[PDB]
Symmetry: none
């Protein structure tokens, strides 16, 4: 159940690295150039 949890954390980090790669889509639709 511990290593189910370790590889839930490795779902989360790779959800976060989708969200970051939406955020950095919106910044690059809208910003610096």
């Amino acid at each position: 159940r511990m290593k189910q949890l370790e590889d839930k954390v490795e779902e989360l980090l790779x959800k976060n690295y989708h969200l970051e790669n939406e955020v950095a889509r919106l910044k690059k639709l809208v910003x610096e150039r």
Copy 2:
């Protein structure tokens, strides 16, 4: 302690699904 850590991880999932539902307010500002 694992069953504290799982129940931090399943908080971090329910921060990520806050942050996505902020990002998807900003995407629907921009609309």
Copy 3:
């Protein structure tokens, strides 16, 4: 292993608090 697991979850809390500081860069473009 438990205290490797605690210190992945505190990489994750401290990613979440990077994403919030991308989102609050996006808010300071958009609203």
